[PDB]
UniProtKB/Swiss-Prot annotation, chain A:
Keyword RNA-binding included in the entry's annotation: yes
Remaining remarks: Present with 573 molecules/cell in log phase SD medium. There are 2 genes for eS4 in yeast.
Localization, UniProt: Cytoplasm
Organism: Saccharomyces cerevisiae (strain ATCC 204508 / S288c)
Domain of life: Eukaryota
Residue ranges constituting the S4 RNA-binding domain according to the UniProt record: 29-92
SUPFAM superfamilies: Alpha-L RNA-binding motif
Phylogenetic classification of the source organism: Eukaryota, Fungi, Dikarya, Ascomycota, Saccharomycotina
Any one Gene Ontology BP term: cytoplasmic translation
Identification of the protein by name: Small ribosomal subunit protein eS4A
From Swiss-Prot, chain B:
Subunit structure: Component of the small ribosomal subunit (SSU). Mature yeast ribosomes consist of a small (40S) and a large (60S) subunit. The 40S small subunit contains 1 molecule of ribosomal RNA (18S rRNA) and 33 different proteins (encoded by 57 genes). The large 60S subunit contains 3 rRNA molecules (25S, 5.8S and 5S rRNA) and 46 different proteins (encoded by 81 genes).
Protein family according to the UniProt entry: Belongs to the universal ribosomal protein uS17 family.
Family annotation (Pfam families): Ribosomal_S17 (PF00366), Ribosomal_S17_N (PF16205)
GO molecular function: rRNA binding; structural constituent of ribosome
Gene Ontology CC entries for this record: 90S preribosome; cytosol; cytosolic small ribosomal subunit
Localization (cell): Cytoplasm
Keyword rRNA-binding: yes
SUPFAM superfamilies: Nucleic acid-binding proteins
Name by which UniProt lists this protein: Small ribosomal subunit protein uS17A
GO annotation terms (biological process): maturation of SSU-rRNA from tricistronic rRNA transcript (SSU-rRNA, 5.8S rRNA, LSU-rRNA); ribosomal small subunit assembly; translation
PTM entry text: N-terminally acetylated by acetyltransferase NatA.
From Swiss-Prot, chain C:
Protein name: U3 small nucleolar ribonucleoprotein protein LCP5
Something else known: Present with 1430 molecules/cell in log phase SD medium.
GO biological process, one term: maturation of SSU-rRNA from tricistronic rRNA transcript (SSU-rRNA, 5.8S rRNA, LSU-rRNA)
Primary gene name: LCP5
Main location group: nucleus
Any one GO cellular component localisation term in the record: small-subunit processome
Biased composition (Basic and acidic residues): 127-136
UniProt keyword list: Acetylation, Nucleus, Ribonucleoprotein, Ribosome biogenesis, rRNA processing
Keyword S-adenosyl-L-methionine included in the entry's annotation: no
Range covered out of full length: 222 to 357 of 357
Entry function: Component of the U3 small nucleolar ribonucleoprotein. Required for the early cleavages at sites A0, A1 and A2 of the pre-ribosomal RNA. Participates in ribosome biogenesis.
Record's subcellular location: Nucleus, Nucleolus
Residue ranges crossing the lipid bilayer per the database entry: none
UniProtKB/Swiss-Prot annotation, chain D:
Gene giving rise to this polypeptide: RPS8A
In-chain residues carrying the UniProt-annotated modification Phosphoserine: 65, 68, 72, 85, 127-128, 131, 134
A GO term from the CC aspect: cytosol
Name the UniProt record assigns to this protein: Small ribosomal subunit protein eS8A
Family per record: Belongs to the eukaryotic ribosomal protein eS8 family.
RNA sequence: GCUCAUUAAAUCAGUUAUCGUUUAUUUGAUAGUCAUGGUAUAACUGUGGUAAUUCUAGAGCUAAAAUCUCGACCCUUUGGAAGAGAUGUAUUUAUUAGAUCAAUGUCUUCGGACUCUUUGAUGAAUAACUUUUCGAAUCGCAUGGCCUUGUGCUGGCGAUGGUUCAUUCAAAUUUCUGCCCUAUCAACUUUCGAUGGUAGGAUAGUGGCCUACCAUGGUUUCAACGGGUAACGGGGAAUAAGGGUUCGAUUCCGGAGAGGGAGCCUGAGAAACGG
């Protein structure tokens, strides 16, 4: 069992494996861990099945009926009961954190582009980290930038180019998952670019450029970070 | 002589000379554009993509054909003794006919979708 | 050079139980001056007798189960390869060491008290100017 | 059949001969079909489950492109002229990539007359090719893999590349 | 799934690289180019053979389209349009595409001129081929619209396919750094290619992987290469023991095999012993 699920070692031998999906499997949190295990909505594994078939839960504007469905970082998980909307966000200590958001904030998500090329018949396209490929983006949108997604359609309402001095979340590596808003961008052999980070206590931290997820300007983040 | 092999040498063209930039601040030399060598394995004007390790070292042996040997000296740190050890790593690399190489020749290469059985790096800069 | 850039669960893992030495905290409970939530009398003892009364570790770890059972509404059970040690070797740790519900197994230990504290352990005043600021 | 396991041959420093494992399926190799000129037979191979490859073994017609006018006309195939890797292939008339052949000049001839209004050296092109139009046999080269696509596709010789190969043929 | 035989830059551990590759499933994008064709399996009906079989024999049945730009014009308001033309999918090879402007800069004769510097802002399909692939003889809700009123003509929202791309589950190689003893192993390799070049082949693909032809190189006192390893020893691989002093369990070994050899076939995956 991985670290970031907050499961106990107790209650049963085998760990619930993730399904293949949009997110990476080691980055994923399955919905069985999301409902009965951390949010404590269900008790048995079969009780997760009754919730999914009745279509209570919707993840990122889709029905999303699967027990081991992979949910990852920055995923709007809308539950039709209680009129409450949930957004997954990683916690500094090594784990995931379920977070309350608003209806307007459940409309948009942010997404890191991983690769951009020129599609067929002369069409630009960007590929997000959640695998949402979008036709005709802004040519300003280039590699490692975030993308604000409409989720009513697949359209792009805001875009933030990668420039030094903007509030960055880390997705990967040792120092994974903090604020720290940038020091600069380092070059190294093999790429291995180390986009440096100085936190609220102004301490240098080093992860890869692959792990960099721009969650806002210096000052404003675009989403409601959980305060605690 | 250009056409000295048994087959006619040409670029695939994927001036009568087609160029491209290998990137990362490695400039296209005069020998690349206005030259005579074909060299499909060359970073510029060829069919390789420099991605992966961009490393540096010292060329120590040049007596091969179209390829050279980089010696990569460094210092190891042993934590038990709290001493140092002098080391080196003789790495053979493909050289392109744009760079004037003999013994010496501080060099820079790039990882190039391994060419031949030990060659993973092709010469992109010689100083 | 080369760098690992690998995430570690073990560095984020809590190590509180590794250096936690029981006689040190018994000084704490007297010098804490907070109350300490003692249970009732007959609520302690195990099986009308035979099992010695309760360890204060035992009313902790059993409390951890009841705090876990009221959250998940379910129970945990007779699972055998863990039970064959942790019920045999634990209830014999009672009869070897606990006397009247209070543990005397501390005092035969070779685990020494110094290795927890160790002149504050790390962040030690190794230089002269470090020693002046602890006087501050 | 053919195995591509890199262990058995020696190291850079001379360490050798482990036989850590036996030959397995993903390190596979199959066999060349030395294709000839005859009535076209199409071969079938199933490769990695979903994909397929086209072995070629006898080839009658193929598509060749005339490089000066940029037009493409399907070509009847007669004989093999030159190949650099091994001249055993030419004397057995075997087609591979970069193989010099002889073709029929009449399909490129029929395009030249009724579209333009001229004959073929009895609208100006090279001198070394125009003398070959009266011969009825033009020289062409292969730019496809018959071992993979199965087709005999290629290019006719023009320019200085013409002068390179005709120097070899004398 | 079980059982037999011990590997030292190998495994493994992390790390890349996949613009070097293949991928069933997962997810996200994406296609304007006859109220019903023609076949076909049997079961069955009955006759038999065969020591025997999940063995067998013979017989009779069931052109039109629409969109893109051009717009003569007419008309001022929601603006609307005649006709001028232009466009297959996959697969295969060859060919083709993939200097400037605005002023706020500056000059001026106050009319404008100038892009030297700045500020912004633009750029960087043809011709053929194919044992012609697809272009839906697919399903559910809504039942509406026009007239020559026939059960005609037309028309909404989906779902499932299906091409290609991306995604993930993989797998394949790969980058790099990190293993125990040893000079009573100093040369090792080219003595199954060793080092590389180029060309072909093979493969999912890189590639001396294989083979032609061409050069004589590789690693090394910084220890190559060779030897010993009882490599039941080791891996924080992983929690663990809230004082048993450093305890536990779990996972990982590495390889081969299914009477022995050898060759093959399906499948995303096996060189599969329940062929």
């Amino acid at each position: 069992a991985p670290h970031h699920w907050l499961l106990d070692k107790l209650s049963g031998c085998y760990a619930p494996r993730p399904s293949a999906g949009p997110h990476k499997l080691r980055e994923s949190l399955p919905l069985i861990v999301f409902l009965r295990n951390r949010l404590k909505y269900a008790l048995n594994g079969r009780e997760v099945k009754a919730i999914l078939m009745q279509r209570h839960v919707k993840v990122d504007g889709k029905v999303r009926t699967d027990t081991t469905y992979p949910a990852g970082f920055m995923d709007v998980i809308t539950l039709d009961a209680t009129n409450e909307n949930f957004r997954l966000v990683y916690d500094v200590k090594g784990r995931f954190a379920v977070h309350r958001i608003t209806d307007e904030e459940a409309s948009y998500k942010l997404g890191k582009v991983k690769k951009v090329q020129l599609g067929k018949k002369g069409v630009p396209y960007v590929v997000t980290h959640d695998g949402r490929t979008i036709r005709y983006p802004d040519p300003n949108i280039k590699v490692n930038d975030t993308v604000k997604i409409d989720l009513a359609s697949g359209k792009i309402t805001d875009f933030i180019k990668f420039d030094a001095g903007k509030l960055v979340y880390v997705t990967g590596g040792r120092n994974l998952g903090r604020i720290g808003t940038i020091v600069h961008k380092e070059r190294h052999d093999g790429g291995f670019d180390l986009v440096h980070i100085k936190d609220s206590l102004d301490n240098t931290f080093v992860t890869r450029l692959n792990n960099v997820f721009v969650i806002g300007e210096q000052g404003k983040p675009y989403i409601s970070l959980p305060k605690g | 002589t250009v056409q000295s092999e048994r087959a006619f040498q040409k670029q695939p063209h994927i001036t009568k000379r087609w160029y491209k930039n290998a990137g990362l601040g490695f400039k296209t030399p005069k020998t690349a554009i206005e030259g005579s060598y074909i060299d499909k394995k060359c970073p510029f004007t060829g069919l390789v993509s420099i991605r992966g390790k961009i490393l540096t070292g010292t060329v120590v042996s040049t007596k091969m054909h179209r390829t050279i040997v980089i010696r990569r000296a460094y210092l190891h740190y042993i934590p038990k003794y709290n001493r140092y050890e002098k080391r080196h790593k003789n790495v053979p690399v493909h050289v392109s006919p744009a760079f004037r190489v003999q013994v010496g020749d501080i060099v820079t290469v790039g990882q190039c979708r391994p060419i031949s059985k030990t060659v993973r790096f092709n010469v992109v800069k010689v100083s | 050079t080369h760098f690992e850039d690998r995430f570690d669960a073990r560095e984020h893992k809590d190590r509180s139980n590794k250096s936690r030495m029981q006689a040190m905290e018994e000084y704490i409970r007297e010098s804490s001056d907070q109350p300490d939530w003692s249970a009732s009398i007959g609520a302690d003892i195990v099986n009308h007798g035979r099992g010695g009364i309760k360890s204060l570790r035992d009313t902790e770890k059993e409390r951890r189960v009841t705090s876990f059972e009221e959250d998940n509404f379910t129970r945990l059970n007779i699972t055998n390869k863990a039970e064959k040690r942790k019920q045999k070797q634990r209830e014999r740790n009672a009869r070897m060491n606990v006397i009247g519900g209070e543990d005397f197994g501390i005092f035969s230990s070779k685990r020494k008290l110094e290795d927890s504290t160790s002149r504050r352990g790390a962040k030690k005043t190794r230089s002269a100017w470090d020693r002046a600021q602890r006087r501050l | 059949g053919i195995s591509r396991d890199s262990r058995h041959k020696r190291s850079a420093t001379g360490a050798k001969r482990a036989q850590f494992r036996k030959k397995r399926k993903f390190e596979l190799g199959r066999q060349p079909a030395n294709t000839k000129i005859g009535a076209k037979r199409i071969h079938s191979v199933r490769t990695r489950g979903g994909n397929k490859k086209y072995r070629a073994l006898r080839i009658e017609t193929g598509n060749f492109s005339w490089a000066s006018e940029g037009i493409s006309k399907k070509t009847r195939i007669a004989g093999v002229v030159y190949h650099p890797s091994n001249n055993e292939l030419v004397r057995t008339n075997t087609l591979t990539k970069a193989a010099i052949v002889q073709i029929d000049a009449t399909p490129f001839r029929q395009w030249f007359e009724a579209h333009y209004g001229q004959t073929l050296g009895k609208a100006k092109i090279e001198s070394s090719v125009e003398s070959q139009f009266s011969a009825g046999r033009l020289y062409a080269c292969i730019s496809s893999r018959p071992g993979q696509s199965g087709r005999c596709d290629g290019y006719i010789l023009e320019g200085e590349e013409l002068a390179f190969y005709l120097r070899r043929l004398t």
